[PDB]
Amino acid sequence: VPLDGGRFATSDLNDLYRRVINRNNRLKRLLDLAAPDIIVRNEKRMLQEA
Amino acid sequence: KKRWYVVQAFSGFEGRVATSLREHIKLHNMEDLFGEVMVGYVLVQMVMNDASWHLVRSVPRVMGFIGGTSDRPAPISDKEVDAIMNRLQQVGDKPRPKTLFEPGEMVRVNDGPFADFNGVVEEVDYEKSRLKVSVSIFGRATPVELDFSQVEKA
Amino acid sequence: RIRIRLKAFDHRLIDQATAEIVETAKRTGAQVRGPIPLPTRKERFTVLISPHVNKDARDQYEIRTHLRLVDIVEPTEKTVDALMRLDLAAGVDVQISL
Amino acid sequence: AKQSMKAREVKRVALADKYFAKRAELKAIISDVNASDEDRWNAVLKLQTLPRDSSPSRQRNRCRQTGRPHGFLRKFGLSRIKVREAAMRGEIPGLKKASW
DNA sequence: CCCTGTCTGGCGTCCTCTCACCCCATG
DNA sequence: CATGGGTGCGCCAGACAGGG
């Protein structure tokens, strides 16, 4: 829902879900591109922490 | 011999990280310890001394290397690293020019109101460079002429 | 330039069916090269009405298949946008000729 | 007609789409201005290796509603007695009395 | 293995009434 | 325009080492 002004005051769960989906899309694209080992380890580790 | 390494930067300031890295090299004049810098990850041709490691992590807006450990960080691990880089470049340089369709061949439309629609080419005209394909719009087939680039081969 | 060829049976429907695409193209392109007459085929048939002999008694059946042309002149990128998937008159087979 | 007769047609339909119009190059190219020696003898004779009842000339023409042999019409695809009762019932889209 | 020290987690009163302020930053 | 990353609390308690 927005506030008086009009800027949408967004919830925290939307930040969390949007982070997980951004990272998951990045990880699918790197497994498409066949990135090396350390790149996809950091990518999966950032998804795990997300 | 200089081997490759992966550097993590603040994603978005990557060109400025690359420029500041070249400038820190030409400041602390370890010119014989750095080969190139390739572009959120920055590829660095390098050797491993602890002095050069402190140099790259003292470059601003750089988090650190990505490897097995932080004592002795890791070069690279890919069967075809050159082919992976070629695939990344091919993503940006996508040709996508499939349009060749004979009679009875299905095609795809991605231009004009007929975009996002498929159909078959009942007649073809290489001389006029036009394909005769109809689109199933509201059921009835809508025989329309589309260019090879205007439609994609299905 | 962009032709639209109409095909139907009900000639009392096709003049309104072409009018339904006239109004769909008038408010978008504002130049449509008329509802051209386009002569109609008269497929004639004859049938022995009896289930047997007396080949004198027959019945004649025909199907007037009416045609029209709309012929959108200019391909401004909003005319066809109001045409594709936005037509009507179930039973009137439509087709583009371009 | 006969339920025996309508079964023979669909059996001869199955031969006309499996063998013929697909293995029709046996006469299309090889029984022409090509090698007119007795290898062209193998063109005409291997055509006999396929069954006799497989040709599209063999599939006579039969109605689809009742299967009457004679009085067929290609447009409606069914027999002349069946096109009229469906004309008066209002089934063929557009048949009225041709009184020109 | 039997006791001893450390290291992290889990928790701490209820209703109300105003106020002020909510992501830069930038090629 | 849109995305991308301090240093003043105190007790209980059980799990994890650490001797013992």
Curated annotation (Swiss-Prot), chain A:
Applied biotechnology uses: Co-administration of salinamide and rifampicin or salinamide and myxopyronin suppresses the emergence of resistance to both antibiotics.
Assembly, per entry: The RNAP catalytic core consists of 2 alpha, 1 beta, 1 beta' and 1 omega subunit. When a sigma factor is associated with the core the holoenzyme is formed, which can initiate transcription. The rRNA transcription and antitermination complex (rrnTAC) consists of RNAP, NusA, NusB, NusE (rpsJ), NusG, SubB, ribosomal protein S4, DNA and precursor rRNA; S4 is more flexible than other subunits.
Species in which this protein is naturally found: Escherichia coli (strain K12)
Gene coding for it: rpoC
Record protein name field: DNA-directed RNA polymerase subunit beta'
Role of this protein: DNA-dependent RNA polymerase (RNAP) catalyzes the transcription of DNA into RNA using the four ribonucleoside triphosphates as substrates.
Maturation and modification: Acetylated on several lysine residues in the presence of glucose.
Family: Belongs to the RNA polymerase beta' chain family.
From Swiss-Prot, chain B:
Residues in coiled coil: none
Cited InterPro entries: KOW, NGN, NGN-like_dom, NGN_dom_sf, NusG-like, Rib_uL2_dom2, Transcrpt_antiterm_NusG, Transcrpt_antiterm_NusG_bac_CS
Gene3D superfamilies: 2.30.30.30, NusG, N-terminal domain (3.30.70.940)
Pfam families hit by this protein: KOW (PF00467), NusG (PF02357)
One GO cellular component term noted in the UniProt record for this chain: transcription elongation factor complex
Entry keyword set: Ribosome biogenesis, Transcription, Transcription antitermination, Transcription regulation, Transcription termination
Superkingdom of origin: Bacteria
GO process annotations (BP): DNA-templated transcription termination; regulation of DNA-templated transcription elongation; ribosome biogenesis; transcription antitermination; transcription elongation-coupled chromatin remodeling
KOW domain location: 103-134
Free-text domain note: The N-terminal domain interacts with RNAP and the C-terminal domain binds either to Rho or to RpsJ (NusE). These domains are separated by a flexible linker.
Family: Belongs to the NusG family.
Subunit note: Monomer. Interacts with the transcription termination factor Rho and with RNAP. One NusG monomer forms a stable complex with a Rho hexamer. Binds directly, but weakly, to the core enzyme of RNAP. Also interacts with RpsJ (NusE). The rRNA transcription and antitermination complex (rrnTAC) consists of RNAP, NusA, NusB, NusE (rpsJ), NusG, SubB, ribosomal protein S4, DNA and precursor rRNA; S4 is more flexible than other subunits.
Protein name: Transcription termination/antitermination protein NusG
Curated annotation (Swiss-Prot), chain C:
Biological-process GO terms, alphabetical: cytoplasmic translation; regulation of DNA-templated transcription elongation; ribosome biogenesis; transcription antitermination
Keyword Ribonucleoprotein listed: yes
Keyword tags: Ribonucleoprotein, Ribosomal protein, Ribosome biogenesis, RNA-binding, Transcription, Transcription antitermination, Transcription regulation
InterPro entries reported in the protein's UniProt record: Ribosomal_uS10 (IPR001848), Ribosomal_uS10_CS (IPR018268), Ribosomal_uS10_dom (IPR027486), Ribosomal_uS10_dom_sf (IPR036838)
HAMAP family: Ribosomal_uS10
The protein's assembly and partners: Part of the 30S ribosomal subunit. Can also form a heterodimer with the transcription antitermination protein NusB. Binding of S10 to NusB is mutually exclusive with its incorporation into the ribosome. The rRNA transcription and antitermination complex (rrnTAC) consists of RNAP, NusA, NusB, NusE (this protein), NusG, SubB, ribosomal protein S4, DNA and precursor rRNA; S4 is more flexible than other subunits.
The protein's name in its UniProt record: Small ribosomal subunit protein uS10
From Swiss-Prot, chain D:
PANTHER family (alphabetical): 30S RIBOSOMAL PROTEIN S14, SMALL RIBOSOMAL SUBUNIT PROTEIN US14M
One annotated GO molecular function: rRNA binding
Family to which the UniProt record says this protein belongs: Belongs to the universal ribosomal protein uS14 family.
GO biological process, one term: cytoplasmic translation
Primary role: Binds 16S rRNA, required for the assembly of 30S particles and may also be responsible for determining the conformation of the 16S rRNA at the A site.
Pfam annotation, one family: Ribosomal_S14
Quaternary structure (record): Part of the 30S ribosomal subunit. Contacts proteins S3 and S10.
Name recorded for this polypeptide: Small ribosomal subunit protein uS14
Protein species of origin: Escherichia coli (strain K12)
Top-rank taxon: Bacteria
Matching PROSITE patterns: RIBOSOMAL_S14
Keywords, comma-separated and alphabetical: Ribonucleoprotein, Ribosomal protein
Lineage per the UniProt record: Bacteria, Pseudomonadati, Pseudomonadota, Gammaproteobacteria, Enterobacterales
One term under GO cellular component: cytosolic small ribosomal subunit
